Design a protein around this nucleic acid. Sequence first.
RNA 1: UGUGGAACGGGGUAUUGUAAGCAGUAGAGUCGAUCUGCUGAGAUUAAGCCUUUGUUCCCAAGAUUUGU
RNA 2: CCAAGACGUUGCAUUCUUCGAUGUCGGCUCUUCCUAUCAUACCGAAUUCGGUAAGCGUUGGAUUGUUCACCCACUAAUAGGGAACGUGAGCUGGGUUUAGACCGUCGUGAGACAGGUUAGUUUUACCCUACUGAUGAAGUGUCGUCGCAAUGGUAAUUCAACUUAGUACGGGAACCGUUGAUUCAGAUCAUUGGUAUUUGCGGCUGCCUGACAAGGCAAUGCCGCGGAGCUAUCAUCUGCCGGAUAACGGCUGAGCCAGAAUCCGUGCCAGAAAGCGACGAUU
RNA 3: GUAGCCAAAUGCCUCGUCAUCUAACUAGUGACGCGCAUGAAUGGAUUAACGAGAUUCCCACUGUCCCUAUCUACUAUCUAG
RNA 4: GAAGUCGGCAAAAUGGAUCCGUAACUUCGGGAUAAGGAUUGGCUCUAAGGGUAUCAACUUAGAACU
RNA 5: CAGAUCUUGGUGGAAGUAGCAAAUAUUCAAAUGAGAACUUUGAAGACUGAAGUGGGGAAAGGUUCCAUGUGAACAGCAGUU
RNA 6: UCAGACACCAGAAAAGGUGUUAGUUC
Lengths: 59, 377, 137
Amino acid sequence: RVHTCYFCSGPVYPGHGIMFVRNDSKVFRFCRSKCHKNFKMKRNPRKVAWTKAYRKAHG
Amino acid sequence: KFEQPRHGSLGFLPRKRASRQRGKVKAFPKDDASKPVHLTAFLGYKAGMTHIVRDLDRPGSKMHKREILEAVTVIETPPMVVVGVVGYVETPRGLRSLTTVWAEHLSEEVKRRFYKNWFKSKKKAFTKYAKKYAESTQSINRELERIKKYCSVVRVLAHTQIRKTPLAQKKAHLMEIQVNGGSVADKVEWAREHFEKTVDIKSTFEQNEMIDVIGVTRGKGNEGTTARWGTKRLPRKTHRGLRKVACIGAWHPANVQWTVARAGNAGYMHRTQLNSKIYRIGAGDDAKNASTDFDATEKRITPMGGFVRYGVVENDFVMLNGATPGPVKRVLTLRKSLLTHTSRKALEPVSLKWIDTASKFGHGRFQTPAEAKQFLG
Amino acid sequence: RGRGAASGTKYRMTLGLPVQAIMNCADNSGAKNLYIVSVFGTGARLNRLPAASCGDMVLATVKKGKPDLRKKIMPAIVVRQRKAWRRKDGVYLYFEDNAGVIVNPKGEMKGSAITGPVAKECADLWPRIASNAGTVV
RNA sequence: UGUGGAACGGGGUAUUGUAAGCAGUAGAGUCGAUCUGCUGAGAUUAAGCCUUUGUUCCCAAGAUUUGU
RNA sequence: CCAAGACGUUGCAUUCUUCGAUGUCGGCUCUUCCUAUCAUACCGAAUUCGGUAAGCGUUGGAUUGUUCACCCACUAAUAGGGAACGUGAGCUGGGUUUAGACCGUCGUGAGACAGGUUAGUUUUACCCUACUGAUGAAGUGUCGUCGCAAUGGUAAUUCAACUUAGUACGGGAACCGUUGAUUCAGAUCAUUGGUAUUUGCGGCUGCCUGACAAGGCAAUGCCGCGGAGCUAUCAUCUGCCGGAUAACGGCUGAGCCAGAAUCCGUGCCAGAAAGCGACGAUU
RNA sequence: GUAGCCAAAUGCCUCGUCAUCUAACUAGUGACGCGCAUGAAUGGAUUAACGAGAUUCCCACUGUCCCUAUCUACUAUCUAG
RNA sequence: GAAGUCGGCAAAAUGGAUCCGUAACUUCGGGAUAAGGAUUGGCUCUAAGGGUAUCAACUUAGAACU
RNA sequence: CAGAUCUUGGUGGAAGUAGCAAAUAUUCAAAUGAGAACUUUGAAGACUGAAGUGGGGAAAGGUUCCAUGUGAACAGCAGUU
RNA sequence: UCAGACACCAGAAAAGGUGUUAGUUC
């Protein structure tokens, strides 16, 4: 099916990203390496201008 | 002491440039007079490739009836126009082309193939042949009767409609396609009735067939033994360099053996890729050709933003399994498989669930422009 | 062999844990890490290091942990792999660290529970590890 | 002398992360890091991306070698 | 070979060349051949021993310069040799290794040791051929299109699980089939990863252009992301059935039959630049 | 041949024996000594600090390697001289 | 993450300053920057530290805010 | 005289080959001229960055200093310098 | 079912072989 990314918060299509699992058994479905690398840099998407998480959480 | 298998295949050398740009069919399927008259090869152009989602109907597998993501290659196949017929007679020295008969009218596409400078020429090709076909149709009749009476192999001269593809080239590609099935008379009358007419790929192939794709691979230029043959990189301490083969031979024989890796051309080579399954034979006029039964979502096969370095596929196309030799927009040959096969993988019918048409230029996140605007504000 | 003791076949996934690799010990057997000395089902390939992936059975030594567990070779199963591998549905999976568990040659865990996520290939391949797994992703 | 070629322009696609300017009952403070609006903006985009009822320009030539 | 596997018996240093110099171990790399066969296939007996058989494969490490070795494992298996003890204008220099130095022993001594211990220059191809690949004059009138196939090359490999089947046979198969993996080969770049002069966008420091803005310099200043291209057993795709046989077992009673991973072809690569054909137009 | 020290840069036998270290060490360290052929200013035994000296091990680190790939400049390359 | 190699050869990693902390051993002098931790921008501010109400001068301590 | 790695001098094949790749880097216009990547002037872009690629001296050189003139030869391309 | 083919000479033996052609004696 279509999955919603965690960083950019846009839609993802099959075989167009990576899925990552942390120690706490939490699953993240990244859409592109750009959001992949930003998340490992611990960059908050709510402060990042191109993410729909920003566009929904800041009005 | 320790040994390893050789690097490279001795059956694919010399590793030289192909003498041909277009993939030559070096073997046609064995003739069966019981089968009806049909063509055995089609000639297309590599539009690009994409990926699909498919439900796998493979009993006994770990992912039976579970979705798989599968890469597919898109080859644009506009109908080919039959313009001639050539007869071959079996002799104690092999096949010999007894005679060749052409159609009355040949388009500018195929007339360019007979010229290097079509712009300068007086365009005299087949002008006298067109005349002799007009007044003297008897001579044509004797030639085909000679083909029927003497020749045992019949091959149609068919050329592509290159103007219909978004290619800068205006010369068509003209090749011989063996006509298998029926008597020699059946093949010749089939060729006569199909002169100047277009043969589409829908008749030749049937959407679940294992074919052989033939073409020249993309040129990688001159390469060293590390990349041309896959040899081990020498250690960092190596004086004069390390991307080489250390020992190219022994003292005796006092020569370099042909089996030793050397630097040289690695690419632009004629290959025959066996067992490629057609996943879909799409029609250019159909506006649903990229829509599956489970997906709807009216869309065309061309990805959003166009095929990279190819254009927009507006004619009939074929969606094949895996990869094919050669870069994009190169002419490719699709022949019927010579070997008979009854494997479950090769026999299972293919039902597409979804076809990706996102931008292959970049990281395309939108299948269609419509829902691209819906996600955007 | 290692594969004979497993239930069913396994798809070719990316190797990410070659020999000499130290990975976390994810069960409660008391070991802290595992040092891969060899991997089962490794044929003959010159200069090629044996390597493991999620669900592969390896020979490991305990570099740090309970002294009775150290200084010995015991079989292990790689349960978490930091190197991404492509599932046949097209999704690429990797874990936050490399991890394994202690097993006997047959495939029964020496420990009683697993801490952290467990690869689905490992769970499908080894029913006992799936039984002792808390979460399978 | 053509659904011709080129040089640009327009559209699409993609990359980055909301440009410069101006405005604010935003800003620790005693002018001022920064923030907000216009602004998923702006820049870039074939250099081996796609497409163009666009704009301007170019082309009916020299040389050379070849006879059953 | 022999009968009482014994006894027996028959077989598989020299100093010719080089001292107006042939670079002198091992490892790495790489290709080829051999069979005296470790594994694989197929047979014959009683897992073991045999026959055909070199098609295919024969590993990751620890110490040691190694060699013969020996350990820790994996594996279907980890067989043995030849190639100037294959391979230094291929490398490396660990071994050997003049000159420095140390130790022990021997010598009155200078010194010696086929004892140990340290440090110690590894030159040149641009010629010929060979081998890679790259053009190419001319027979065939010329040029072009479509082909033919002589010959040369050749490629696939192995394992597991399941089903047979807890059946045959009295604890435990195999034929078939199936799903997957190992090694190898040829491609490909949809997706994923890597790469950054896209100096594409953003960010950062020092200095400089009076400030702002916008730039520049820092032998590509640095940092993040980065399309395209390249590329990954880090990605994906693809990789057979004919004939004639060996061992060996039959048939009739030589001539056939069955018969191996063997052999030759189908297939796949090249196309003879002095092998050829059909076709087009012919100033 | 004392005090000492030792398979030590000194031990042929020899990969000496035992312990330690490692999954595995003809290595290293600790120990043992009928020591081919150790030993006291041919100085013996130690020893802080120091050493581009010789030898092990550990962490960190990494293209040394699994197994390569990509990029830049300069060559090579073609051209005029 | 040394599996390479005769050998970590080459490369990488570390690195300034401030604060905390610092073993064996020792010839008591050292070892020692042992080892190990934390901190670092910009900007608006105050707080002290000098000379004759006023002048001159970088140098440390904080406090927020970003 | 055919030899002596003969002597002296001359000339070949290699061969239009190896090569002319350290020191960031030049570009436009004009002038001169038979001729300009290289001379000169202007404009631009850069570097040495005061332990200089700056300004001087000692040792050594000896006229290389300066103006004018230029067929060659020399400045391993060029050259009006 | 990898015959043999001219001295030196560029090499093979014992023992067998329902191979075959001739002999010897019971």
